Coordinates of C-alpha atoms in Angstrom, one line a residue:
Chain A
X1 CA -21.9 -29.9 -25.0
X2 CA -25.4 -28.9 -26.8
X3 CA -27.5 -30.8 -29.4
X4 CA -28.0 -29.8 -33.0
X5 CA -29.6 -31.5 -36.0
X6 CA -26.3 -32.3 -37.7
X7 CA -25.6 -33.2 -41.3
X8 CA -22.9 -35.4 -42.6
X9 CA -20.1 -33.5 -44.4
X10 CA -21.3 -33.1 -48.1
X11 CA -18.0 -32.7 -50.0
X12 CA -17.7 -36.4 -51.3
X13 CA -21.3 -36.0 -52.6
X14 CA -20.9 -32.5 -54.0
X15 CA -18.5 -33.7 -56.6
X16 CA -20.9 -36.3 -57.8
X17 CA -23.8 -33.8 -58.7
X18 CA -24.4 -33.2 -62.4
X19 CA -27.0 -31.2 -64.2
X20 CA -29.3 -33.5 -66.5
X21 CA -31.3 -31.9 -69.5
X22 CA -33.3 -34.3 -71.8
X23 CA -35.5 -32.4 -74.3
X24 CA -36.6 -29.5 -72.2
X25 CA -36.6 -31.0 -68.8
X26 CA -33.6 -30.3 -66.4
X27 CA -32.8 -31.7 -63.2
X28 CA -29.8 -33.2 -60.9
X29 CA -28.0 -36.3 -61.6
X30 CA -25.4 -38.5 -59.6
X31 CA -22.3 -39.1 -61.4
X32 CA -20.5 -42.2 -60.0
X33 CA -17.7 -44.0 -62.1
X34 CA -19.0 -44.1 -65.7
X35 CA -22.8 -43.7 -64.8
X36 CA -25.2 -40.9 -64.1
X37 CA -28.4 -41.7 -62.2
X38 CA -31.4 -39.3 -62.3
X39 CA -35.2 -39.5 -62.1
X40 CA -36.6 -41.2 -65.0
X41 CA -39.1 -38.6 -65.4
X42 CA -36.8 -36.2 -66.6
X43 CA -37.9 -37.6 -70.0
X44 CA -41.4 -36.5 -69.3
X45 CA -43.2 -33.1 -70.6
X46 CA -45.5 -31.7 -67.9
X47 CA -48.3 -33.3 -70.3
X48 CA -46.6 -36.7 -70.1
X49 CA -46.3 -36.5 -66.2
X50 CA -50.1 -36.9 -66.1
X51 CA -50.2 -40.5 -67.5
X52 CA -46.6 -41.6 -68.5
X53 CA -45.9 -44.7 -70.4
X54 CA -42.0 -44.8 -69.6
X55 CA -41.1 -47.6 -71.9
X56 CA -42.5 -45.9 -74.9
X57 CA -41.3 -42.3 -73.9
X58 CA -37.7 -43.7 -73.2
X59 CA -37.9 -45.3 -76.8
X60 CA -38.5 -41.9 -78.6
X61 CA -35.1 -41.1 -77.0
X62 CA -31.3 -42.1 -77.7
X63 CA -28.1 -41.5 -76.0
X64 CA -27.6 -38.0 -77.8
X65 CA -30.9 -36.6 -76.5
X66 CA -29.5 -36.3 -72.9
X67 CA -27.3 -33.3 -71.9
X68 CA -25.1 -34.1 -68.8
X69 CA -23.1 -31.2 -67.5
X70 CA -20.5 -31.1 -64.5
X71 CA -20.0 -27.6 -64.0
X72 CA -18.8 -26.2 -67.3
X73 CA -17.7 -29.9 -68.6
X74 CA -20.1 -31.6 -70.9
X75 CA -20.2 -35.5 -70.7
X76 CA -21.1 -38.1 -73.4
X77 CA -23.4 -40.8 -73.1
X78 CA -22.5 -44.3 -74.7
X79 CA -25.5 -46.6 -73.0
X80 CA -29.0 -45.7 -71.7
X81 CA -31.1 -47.7 -69.4
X82 CA -34.1 -47.6 -67.2
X83 CA -34.0 -49.5 -63.8
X84 CA -37.3 -49.1 -62.1
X85 CA -37.8 -45.5 -61.7
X86 CA -34.2 -44.3 -62.3
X87 CA -32.4 -43.6 -65.6
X88 CA -28.8 -45.1 -65.8
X89 CA -26.8 -43.0 -68.4
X90 CA -23.5 -44.9 -69.3
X91 CA -21.0 -41.9 -70.1
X92 CA -17.3 -42.2 -71.5
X93 CA -15.8 -40.5 -68.5
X94 CA -15.3 -42.1 -65.0
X95 CA -15.9 -39.3 -62.4
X96 CA -12.3 -38.8 -61.0
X97 CA -14.0 -37.5 -57.9
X98 CA -16.0 -40.8 -57.3
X99 CA -15.9 -41.7 -53.5
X100 CA -15.9 -45.3 -52.0
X101 CA -19.9 -45.7 -52.3
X102 CA -22.6 -48.2 -51.9
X103 CA -26.4 -48.1 -52.6
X104 CA -28.5 -49.0 -49.6
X105 CA -32.3 -49.2 -49.0
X106 CA -32.9 -47.6 -45.6
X107 CA -35.5 -48.5 -43.1
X108 CA -38.6 -46.2 -42.0
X109 CA -37.4 -44.4 -39.0
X110 CA -33.6 -44.1 -40.2
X111 CA -32.0 -40.7 -41.0
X112 CA -29.8 -39.3 -43.8
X113 CA -28.3 -36.2 -45.1
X114 CA -29.8 -34.6 -48.3
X115 CA -27.7 -32.4 -50.5
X116 CA -30.3 -30.2 -52.0
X117 CA -29.4 -28.9 -55.7
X118 CA -30.5 -26.7 -58.4
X119 CA -29.2 -27.4 -62.0
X120 CA -26.7 -29.9 -60.8
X121 CA -25.2 -27.4 -58.3
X122 CA -25.4 -27.9 -54.4
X123 CA -27.4 -25.3 -52.5
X124 CA -27.6 -26.8 -49.0
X125 CA -27.4 -29.7 -46.8
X126 CA -29.9 -31.0 -44.1
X127 CA -30.7 -34.1 -41.9
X128 CA -34.1 -35.8 -42.3
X129 CA -35.7 -39.1 -41.4
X130 CA -37.6 -41.5 -43.7
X131 CA -41.1 -41.3 -42.0
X132 CA -42.9 -44.5 -41.0
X133 CA -45.2 -43.7 -44.0
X134 CA -42.2 -43.5 -46.4
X135 CA -42.4 -39.8 -46.9
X136 CA -39.8 -37.2 -45.9
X137 CA -40.5 -33.7 -44.8
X138 CA -37.8 -31.9 -46.8
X139 CA -37.2 -28.5 -48.5
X140 CA -37.4 -29.1 -52.4
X141 CA -38.1 -26.3 -55.0
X142 CA -38.8 -27.2 -58.9
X143 CA -35.5 -28.5 -60.4
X144 CA -34.4 -30.1 -56.7
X145 CA -35.4 -33.4 -58.3
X146 CA -32.4 -36.0 -58.4
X147 CA -31.0 -34.6 -55.2
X148 CA -29.7 -37.5 -53.1
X149 CA -29.7 -38.8 -49.5
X150 CA -26.7 -40.4 -47.9
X151 CA -25.0 -41.6 -44.8
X152 CA -21.2 -41.8 -44.4
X153 CA -19.7 -44.8 -42.6
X154 CA -15.9 -44.3 -42.1
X155 CA -14.7 -43.5 -46.0
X156 CA -17.8 -45.0 -47.7
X157 CA -20.8 -42.8 -48.8
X158 CA -24.1 -44.9 -48.5
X159 CA -26.6 -43.6 -51.0
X160 CA -30.1 -44.3 -49.9
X161 CA -32.5 -41.8 -51.4
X162 CA -33.2 -39.9 -54.5
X163 CA -35.9 -37.2 -54.5
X164 CA -38.6 -37.7 -57.2
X165 CA -41.9 -36.1 -56.2
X166 CA -43.6 -33.6 -54.1
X167 CA -47.1 -34.9 -53.1
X168 CA -50.3 -32.7 -53.5
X169 CA -49.9 -32.4 -49.6
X170 CA -46.5 -30.8 -49.7
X171 CA -44.3 -33.8 -48.4
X172 CA -41.6 -35.6 -50.6
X173 CA -41.4 -39.2 -52.0
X174 CA -38.5 -40.8 -54.0
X175 CA -36.6 -43.8 -54.4
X176 CA -33.5 -45.8 -53.3
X177 CA -30.7 -45.8 -56.1
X178 CA -32.0 -48.9 -57.7
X179 CA -35.1 -46.8 -58.3
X180 CA -37.6 -48.6 -56.2
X181 CA -40.0 -46.0 -54.4
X182 CA -40.0 -45.7 -50.7
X183 CA -43.8 -46.4 -49.9
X184 CA -46.7 -46.8 -52.5
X185 CA -45.7 -43.9 -54.6
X186 CA -45.5 -43.8 -58.3
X187 CA -43.8 -41.2 -60.6
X188 CA -47.0 -39.8 -62.0
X189 CA -49.0 -36.5 -61.3
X190 CA -52.1 -38.2 -60.0
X191 CA -53.4 -37.8 -56.4
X192 CA -51.4 -40.1 -53.9
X193 CA -52.2 -41.0 -50.3
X194 CA -49.3 -40.9 -48.1
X195 CA -51.4 -42.5 -45.1
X196 CA -51.2 -42.2 -41.3
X197 CA -47.9 -41.0 -40.1
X198 CA -46.6 -42.4 -36.6
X199 CA -43.9 -40.7 -34.5
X200 CA -40.7 -42.9 -34.2
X201 CA -41.1 -44.0 -30.6
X202 CA -37.4 -45.2 -30.5
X203 CA -35.9 -41.8 -31.9
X204 CA -37.9 -39.8 -29.3
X205 CA -36.3 -42.0 -26.5
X206 CA -33.1 -41.5 -28.1
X207 CA -33.4 -37.7 -27.9
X208 CA -34.6 -37.9 -24.2
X209 CA -31.4 -39.8 -23.5
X210 CA -29.5 -36.9 -25.4
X211 CA -31.4 -34.4 -23.1
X212 CA -30.2 -36.2 -19.9
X213 CA -26.6 -36.2 -21.2
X214 CA -26.9 -32.3 -21.7
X215 CA -28.3 -31.7 -18.3
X216 CA -31.8 -31.5 -19.2
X217 CA -33.6 -34.1 -16.8
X218 CA -36.9 -32.2 -15.5
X219 CA -38.9 -34.8 -17.2
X220 CA -37.3 -38.0 -15.3
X221 CA -40.3 -39.3 -13.3
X222 CA -40.1 -41.3 -10.1
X223 CA -42.7 -43.8 -11.8
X224 CA -41.6 -46.8 -14.2
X225 CA -43.8 -48.9 -16.5
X226 CA -43.9 -52.1 -18.8
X227 CA -43.4 -52.6 -22.7
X228 CA -47.2 -53.6 -22.9
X229 CA -48.4 -50.8 -20.9
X230 CA -46.1 -48.3 -22.6
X231 CA -47.2 -49.6 -26.1
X232 CA -51.1 -49.3 -25.0
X233 CA -50.4 -45.4 -24.4
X234 CA -48.2 -45.5 -27.6
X235 CA -51.0 -46.8 -29.9
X236 CA -53.3 -44.0 -28.5
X237 CA -50.9 -41.1 -29.5
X238 CA -49.8 -42.8 -32.8
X239 CA -46.4 -43.5 -31.6
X240 CA -44.9 -46.5 -33.3
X241 CA -44.9 -49.8 -31.2
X242 CA -41.6 -50.3 -29.2
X243 CA -39.9 -53.7 -29.8
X244 CA -37.1 -55.6 -27.7
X245 CA -35.1 -54.6 -30.7
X246 CA -35.7 -51.0 -29.8
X247 CA -34.8 -51.6 -26.2
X248 CA -31.7 -53.3 -27.3
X249 CA -30.4 -50.6 -29.5
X250 CA -31.0 -48.2 -26.8
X251 CA -28.9 -50.3 -24.4
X252 CA -25.6 -48.0 -24.6
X253 CA -27.5 -44.7 -23.8
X254 CA -29.2 -46.8 -20.9
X255 CA -25.6 -47.8 -19.8
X256 CA -24.0 -44.2 -20.3
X257 CA -26.9 -42.4 -18.3
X258 CA -27.8 -45.2 -15.8
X259 CA -31.4 -44.9 -16.8
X260 CA -33.2 -48.0 -17.7
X261 CA -34.9 -48.0 -21.2
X262 CA -38.4 -48.9 -19.3
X263 CA -37.9 -46.1 -16.9
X264 CA -37.3 -43.5 -19.7
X265 CA -40.4 -45.1 -21.3
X266 CA -42.4 -44.2 -18.1
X267 CA -41.1 -40.6 -18.5
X268 CA -42.1 -40.6 -22.3
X269 CA -45.7 -41.8 -21.0
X270 CA -46.3 -39.0 -18.6
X271 CA -45.1 -36.6 -21.3
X272 CA -47.6 -38.0 -23.8
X273 CA -50.3 -37.8 -21.2
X274 CA -49.4 -34.4 -19.5
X275 CA -47.9 -32.7 -22.4
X276 CA -45.0 -30.2 -21.6
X277 CA -46.7 -27.6 -19.4
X278 CA -44.9 -25.3 -21.6
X279 CA -41.5 -26.4 -20.8
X280 CA -38.7 -27.2 -23.3
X281 CA -36.2 -30.2 -23.8
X282 CA -33.0 -29.4 -25.7
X283 CA -34.5 -26.0 -26.8
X284 CA -37.8 -27.7 -28.3
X285 CA -41.4 -27.5 -27.0
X286 CA -42.3 -30.8 -28.8
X287 CA -41.0 -34.2 -28.7
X288 CA -38.2 -34.8 -31.4
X289 CA -38.2 -38.1 -33.6
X290 CA -35.7 -37.2 -36.2
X291 CA -32.5 -38.6 -34.2
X292 CA -31.6 -42.3 -34.1
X293 CA -30.0 -43.8 -31.2
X294 CA -27.0 -43.9 -33.7
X295 CA -27.2 -40.3 -34.4
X296 CA -27.4 -39.4 -30.7
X297 CA -24.3 -41.7 -29.9
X298 CA -22.4 -40.2 -32.8
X299 CA -22.9 -36.5 -31.8
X300 CA -22.2 -37.5 -28.0
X301 CA -19.1 -39.4 -28.5
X302 CA -17.7 -37.2 -31.4
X303 CA -17.2 -39.7 -34.4
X304 CA -15.5 -38.7 -37.4
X305 CA -14.9 -40.0 -41.0
Chain B
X1 CA -42.0 -26.9 -50.7
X2 CA -41.1 -27.3 -47.0
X3 CA -38.9 -25.4 -44.7
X4 CA -35.8 -26.9 -43.2
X5 CA -32.8 -25.5 -41.4
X6 CA -30.3 -25.8 -44.1
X7 CA -26.2 -25.6 -43.8
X8 CA -24.1 -24.5 -46.9
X9 CA -22.4 -27.4 -48.5
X10 CA -19.2 -28.1 -46.6
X11 CA -16.6 -29.8 -49.2
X12 CA -14.7 -26.4 -49.8
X13 CA -14.1 -26.1 -46.0
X14 CA -13.6 -29.9 -45.5
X15 CA -10.3 -29.7 -47.6
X16 CA -9.0 -26.9 -45.3
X17 CA -9.5 -28.7 -42.0
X18 CA -5.9 -30.0 -40.4
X19 CA -5.2 -31.5 -37.0
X20 CA -2.9 -29.2 -34.9
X21 CA -0.9 -30.8 -32.0
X22 CA 1.3 -28.5 -29.8
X23 CA 3.1 -30.3 -26.8
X24 CA 0.1 -32.6 -25.6
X25 CA -2.8 -30.3 -26.8
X26 CA -4.5 -31.5 -30.1
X27 CA -7.3 -29.6 -31.9
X28 CA -8.6 -28.5 -35.4
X29 CA -6.7 -26.0 -37.6
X30 CA -7.7 -24.1 -41.0
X31 CA -5.2 -24.6 -43.7
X32 CA -5.4 -21.8 -46.3
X33 CA -2.6 -20.8 -48.6
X34 CA 0.7 -21.3 -46.7
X35 CA -0.9 -20.6 -43.2
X36 CA -2.7 -22.8 -40.5
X37 CA -5.0 -20.8 -38.2
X38 CA -6.1 -22.5 -34.8
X39 CA -7.0 -21.3 -31.3
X40 CA -3.9 -19.9 -29.6
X41 CA -4.8 -21.9 -26.4
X42 CA -3.6 -25.1 -28.2
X43 CA -0.2 -24.1 -26.5
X44 CA -1.9 -24.3 -23.0
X45 CA -1.8 -27.1 -20.5
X46 CA -5.0 -27.5 -18.6
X47 CA -3.0 -25.7 -15.7
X48 CA -2.0 -22.9 -18.1
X49 CA -5.8 -22.4 -19.1
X50 CA -6.5 -21.2 -15.6
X51 CA -4.4 -17.9 -15.9
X52 CA -2.5 -18.0 -19.2
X53 CA 0.4 -15.4 -20.3
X54 CA 0.1 -16.3 -23.9
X55 CA 3.1 -14.0 -24.9
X56 CA 5.2 -16.0 -22.3
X57 CA 3.9 -19.5 -23.2
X58 CA 4.3 -18.9 -27.0
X59 CA 8.2 -17.8 -26.2
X60 CA 8.8 -21.3 -24.7
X61 CA 7.8 -22.5 -28.2
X62 CA 9.3 -22.8 -31.7
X63 CA 8.2 -23.7 -35.2
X64 CA 9.3 -27.5 -34.6
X65 CA 7.0 -27.8 -31.5
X66 CA 3.7 -27.9 -33.5
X67 CA 2.6 -30.9 -35.2
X68 CA 0.2 -30.0 -38.1
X69 CA -1.3 -33.3 -40.0
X70 CA -3.6 -33.1 -43.0
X71 CA -5.1 -36.6 -43.2
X72 CA -1.9 -38.7 -43.2
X73 CA 0.2 -35.8 -44.8
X74 CA 2.5 -34.0 -42.2
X75 CA 3.1 -30.2 -42.8
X76 CA 6.3 -28.3 -42.0
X77 CA 6.2 -24.9 -40.2
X78 CA 8.6 -21.9 -41.1
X79 CA 7.0 -18.9 -39.2
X80 CA 4.8 -18.8 -36.2
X81 CA 2.7 -15.8 -35.1
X82 CA -0.3 -14.8 -32.6
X83 CA -2.8 -12.5 -34.0
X84 CA -5.0 -11.7 -31.1
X85 CA -6.5 -15.0 -29.8
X86 CA -5.4 -17.0 -33.0
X87 CA -2.1 -18.8 -33.9
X88 CA -1.0 -18.5 -37.4
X89 CA 1.5 -21.1 -38.6
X90 CA 3.3 -20.3 -41.8
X91 CA 3.9 -23.8 -43.5
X92 CA 6.1 -24.5 -46.6
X93 CA 3.1 -26.2 -48.6
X94 CA 0.3 -23.9 -49.9
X95 CA -3.1 -26.1 -49.5
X96 CA -3.9 -27.0 -53.2
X97 CA -7.5 -27.4 -52.0
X98 CA -7.6 -23.7 -51.0
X99 CA -11.0 -22.2 -52.1
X100 CA -11.5 -18.5 -52.8
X101 CA -12.1 -17.2 -49.5
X102 CA -12.4 -13.9 -47.3
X103 CA -12.4 -13.5 -43.5
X104 CA -15.5 -11.5 -42.3
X105 CA -16.6 -10.4 -38.9
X106 CA -20.4 -11.0 -38.9
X107 CA -23.1 -8.9 -36.9
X108 CA -25.2 -10.4 -34.1
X109 CA -28.3 -12.1 -35.5
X110 CA -26.5 -13.4 -38.6
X111 CA -26.4 -17.1 -39.7
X112 CA -23.4 -19.3 -40.5
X113 CA -22.7 -23.0 -41.1
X114 CA -20.3 -24.8 -38.7
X115 CA -18.2 -27.9 -39.8
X116 CA -17.7 -29.4 -36.5
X117 CA -14.4 -31.3 -36.4
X118 CA -12.4 -33.9 -34.1
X119 CA -8.7 -34.2 -34.9
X120 CA -8.8 -32.1 -37.9
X121 CA -11.5 -34.6 -39.2
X122 CA -15.1 -33.3 -40.3
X123 CA -17.8 -35.1 -38.2
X124 CA -20.8 -32.9 -39.4
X125 CA -22.5 -29.7 -40.4
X126 CA -25.1 -27.4 -39.0
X127 CA -26.7 -23.9 -39.2
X128 CA -26.5 -21.4 -36.2
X129 CA -26.9 -17.9 -35.5
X130 CA -24.5 -15.4 -33.7
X131 CA -26.8 -14.6 -30.6
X132 CA -27.4 -11.0 -29.7
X133 CA -25.3 -11.7 -26.6
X134 CA -22.5 -12.9 -29.0
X135 CA -22.6 -16.7 -28.0
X136 CA -23.8 -19.5 -30.3
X137 CA -25.8 -22.8 -29.3
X138 CA -23.7 -25.3 -30.9
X139 CA -22.6 -28.9 -30.4
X140 CA -19.1 -29.1 -29.5
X141 CA -17.2 -32.0 -27.5
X142 CA -13.6 -31.6 -26.4
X143 CA -11.1 -31.3 -29.5
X144 CA -14.0 -29.6 -31.6
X145 CA -12.0 -26.5 -30.8
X146 CA -10.8 -24.6 -34.1
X147 CA -14.0 -25.8 -35.8
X148 CA -14.9 -22.9 -38.1
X149 CA -18.2 -21.1 -39.2
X150 CA -18.7 -19.9 -42.7
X151 CA -21.0 -18.6 -45.4
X152 CA -20.4 -19.2 -49.1
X153 CA -21.3 -16.3 -51.6
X154 CA -21.1 -17.5 -55.1
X155 CA -17.5 -19.2 -55.4
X156 CA -16.0 -17.5 -52.3
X157 CA -16.1 -19.0 -48.6
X158 CA -16.4 -16.3 -46.1
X159 CA -15.0 -17.5 -42.8
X160 CA -16.6 -15.6 -39.9
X161 CA -16.1 -17.8 -36.7
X162 CA -13.5 -20.1 -35.0
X163 CA -14.7 -22.0 -31.9
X164 CA -12.7 -21.5 -28.7
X165 CA -14.4 -22.0 -25.4
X166 CA -17.6 -23.7 -23.8
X167 CA -18.8 -21.3 -21.0
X168 CA -19.6 -22.8 -17.7
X169 CA -23.3 -22.3 -18.7
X170 CA -23.0 -24.7 -21.8
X171 CA -23.0 -22.1 -24.6
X172 CA -20.3 -21.5 -27.0
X173 CA -17.7 -18.5 -27.8
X174 CA -14.9 -17.9 -30.1
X175 CA -13.5 -15.4 -32.4
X176 CA -13.4 -14.2 -36.0
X177 CA -10.4 -15.3 -38.1
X178 CA -8.4 -12.4 -36.9
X179 CA -8.8 -13.8 -33.6
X180 CA -11.1 -10.9 -32.0
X181 CA -13.5 -12.8 -29.8
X182 CA -17.3 -12.3 -30.6
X183 CA -18.6 -10.6 -27.2
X184 CA -16.8 -9.9 -23.8
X185 CA -15.1 -13.4 -23.6
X186 CA -11.4 -14.2 -23.0
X187 CA -9.5 -17.4 -23.8
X188 CA -9.0 -18.3 -20.1
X189 CA -10.8 -20.9 -17.9
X190 CA -12.6 -18.3 -15.4
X191 CA -16.4 -17.9 -14.7
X192 CA -17.5 -15.6 -17.6
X193 CA -21.0 -13.9 -17.9
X194 CA -22.7 -14.4 -21.2
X195 CA -25.4 -11.6 -20.4
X196 CA -29.0 -11.4 -21.3
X197 CA -29.9 -13.0 -24.7
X198 CA -32.7 -11.4 -26.7
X199 CA -34.8 -13.1 -29.7
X200 CA -33.8 -11.8 -33.1
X201 CA -37.0 -10.0 -33.9
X202 CA -36.2 -9.6 -37.5
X203 CA -35.4 -13.4 -38.0
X204 CA -38.8 -14.6 -36.4
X205 CA -40.5 -12.1 -38.9
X206 CA -38.5 -13.7 -41.7
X207 CA -39.6 -17.1 -40.5
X208 CA -43.3 -16.2 -40.3
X209 CA -43.0 -15.0 -44.0
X210 CA -41.5 -18.5 -44.8
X211 CA -44.5 -20.0 -43.1
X212 CA -47.0 -18.0 -45.1
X213 CA -45.0 -18.9 -48.4
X214 CA -45.4 -22.7 -47.3
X215 CA -49.3 -22.3 -46.5
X216 CA -49.0 -22.0 -42.9
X217 CA -51.2 -18.9 -42.4
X218 CA -53.4 -19.4 -39.2
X219 CA -51.5 -16.5 -37.2
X220 CA -52.4 -13.9 -39.8
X221 CA -54.6 -11.4 -37.6
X222 CA -57.1 -8.9 -38.9
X223 CA -55.3 -6.4 -36.6
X224 CA -52.3 -4.1 -37.5
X225 CA -49.9 -2.1 -35.4
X226 CA -47.1 0.6 -35.5
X227 CA -43.3 0.4 -35.0
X228 CA -43.3 2.2 -31.7
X229 CA -46.2 0.0 -30.3
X230 CA -44.8 -3.1 -31.5
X231 CA -41.3 -2.3 -30.0
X232 CA -43.3 -1.5 -26.7
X233 CA -44.4 -5.3 -26.6
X234 CA -40.9 -6.3 -28.1
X235 CA -39.0 -5.0 -24.9
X236 CA -41.5 -6.9 -22.6
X237 CA -40.6 -10.2 -24.2
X238 CA -36.8 -9.6 -24.6
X239 CA -37.3 -9.3 -28.3
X240 CA -34.5 -7.0 -30.0
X241 CA -36.0 -3.8 -31.0
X242 CA -37.1 -3.5 -34.8
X243 CA -35.5 -0.7 -36.7
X244 CA -36.3 0.7 -40.3
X245 CA -33.3 -1.0 -41.5
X246 CA -35.1 -4.2 -40.3
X247 CA -38.4 -3.3 -42.2
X248 CA -36.3 -2.6 -45.4
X249 CA -34.6 -5.9 -45.2
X250 CA -38.0 -7.7 -45.1
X251 CA -39.1 -5.6 -48.1
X252 CA -39.0 -8.3 -50.5
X253 CA -40.8 -10.9 -48.5
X254 CA -43.3 -8.3 -48.0
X255 CA -43.7 -8.1 -51.8
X256 CA -43.7 -11.8 -52.4
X257 CA -46.5 -12.4 -49.7
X258 CA -48.5 -9.1 -50.1
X259 CA -48.2 -8.8 -46.5
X260 CA -47.1 -5.4 -45.0
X261 CA -44.1 -5.9 -42.5
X262 CA -46.2 -3.8 -39.9
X263 CA -49.1 -6.1 -40.4
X264 CA -46.8 -9.4 -40.0
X265 CA -45.5 -7.3 -36.8
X266 CA -49.1 -7.1 -35.3
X267 CA -49.4 -11.0 -35.9
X268 CA -46.0 -11.6 -34.1
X269 CA -47.3 -9.4 -31.1
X270 CA -50.7 -11.4 -30.8
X271 CA -48.3 -14.5 -30.6
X272 CA -46.2 -13.0 -28.0
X273 CA -49.3 -12.1 -25.9
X274 CA -51.6 -15.2 -26.3
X275 CA -48.8 -17.8 -27.1
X276 CA -49.5 -20.5 -29.7
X277 CA -52.6 -22.1 -28.0
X278 CA -50.7 -25.6 -28.6
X279 CA -50.7 -25.0 -32.5
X280 CA -47.3 -25.0 -34.6
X281 CA -45.6 -23.1 -37.3
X282 CA -43.6 -24.9 -39.9
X283 CA -43.6 -27.9 -37.5
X284 CA -42.5 -25.9 -34.4
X285 CA -44.2 -24.9 -31.2
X286 CA -42.1 -22.0 -30.6
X287 CA -41.1 -18.9 -32.6
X288 CA -37.8 -19.6 -34.4
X289 CA -35.1 -16.7 -34.7
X290 CA -32.1 -18.6 -36.4
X291 CA -33.4 -17.8 -40.1
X292 CA -32.3 -14.4 -41.7
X293 CA -34.5 -12.8 -44.2
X294 CA -31.4 -13.7 -46.6
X295 CA -31.7 -17.3 -45.6
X296 CA -35.6 -17.5 -46.0
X297 CA -35.3 -15.7 -49.5
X298 CA -32.3 -18.3 -50.6
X299 CA -34.3 -21.4 -49.4
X300 CA -37.5 -20.0 -51.1
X301 CA -35.7 -18.9 -54.5
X302 CA -33.5 -22.1 -54.8
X303 CA -30.0 -20.1 -54.9
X304 CA -26.9 -22.1 -55.7
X305 CA -23.1 -21.6 -55.7

């Protein structure tokens, strides 16, 4: 009963969060086995950030220039490395709090939990989506940098995101845990175009299914539609095109609710065309696109870890 | 930058969550030092739930009738007790994962984090508010019962909520950790009136301050107003009355933004009167009342634990 934006439990990530200080710069790092991961821009002065040569900057640094704190512990570095936009600090001590973990590159539209940190200390947890334009709309103050995004499958934390940048426009960009940026972004203080964001059509449909499951059904129309005709309306309202992969992924919600995907699509179209008339769906006056069909199923079936 | 519904990090509560099975009934329990806390209705059959005599039901039970699991561990009970609507199971093993903790009874309008669990296993975390009518709008499937709400001040987890009931109306009710219900509710399957909910006026104002801080200022009107005149409009729109305690609590947001509380109140009134004209504030087309002035300050100043 009820439907909330729900984060994964954060304990297994909390015990991996370290404070990283190189020269003056201090931000969050991820301590897994014998390696601390952090944004490579920790080696930058505000002046460096304007036009950084990371290769050159990293050279004027050695192992002993990096202060990695875990609470009141102080760790020791024995091998530093730059993988794309992440700094890998090889330390002597394996994190005894290290969970089963993988690094994953997620797709636009997918969701993850962010454990937001300041000085390697957890402040809070929230759910977000990789936007279609590879930004995220998060909550990040100075020093939040190196905060990580993750999913939990079973026993296994899947790290998918590290926060690097706020864009002049207020939205966020960062990397996978191999330090490849999501999107066209670079770790440099220069104007960077996010580009046109679209609504994650498959997520809005997931959420409409969620609404039906929790008794919110006012928007089910007698009409139906076709994929081509729906995608005509979708393109007008900067909704991502819907594919058969999308219809397939919604199959189980279709089966639980007895509502054909294309029927739900005809409901969505009327909503895109007529707006909401000032009514609400699951407490919201706008169409929500930050739940996956997987998230909706997890919350509705009570999956645990 | 940005503004998200943010939960407290959940690790310190995760290692306190146990599975409680009496007879057939299984739900979540809170293992602190040598005591497991759970809804006393775990001793009820679906039939019992209609008209339970808890005193009598608890008597046909003894220590060895209660199966408390922590993961794959199995705990042993040496003293059972009923405090109001909570069952206290005295076990032999102190939880070595026990944080610094207090039990607090929170006030209507205050927020907390819920760690939602099924079979004593964490599934997810989310932020909610005690509604003015002492319900909560959460996400709780069967077996979620005994899921706890909490705040973290510094090192210290403040437990304020245990989930007991879904009401026929889909909203949730439960207790403090001394087992006193929030609101008029009883742990019995009978029709129970929540009563009229109001909007938490002080929280909506907090959130308007949050919006100003993140550059969302379209709603600041040239007008101002008075407390009496504002509370006239408030009562019309089932907003809680605003008191001088409320104005005082907003003082620091007033000072950070250079916007007098009563001025922000005049903005709120125009919004209550004219609606939103289809515009949004911090991504929302409705007025948000589940952030406290404290939450807004914590997210905007980057407080950690």
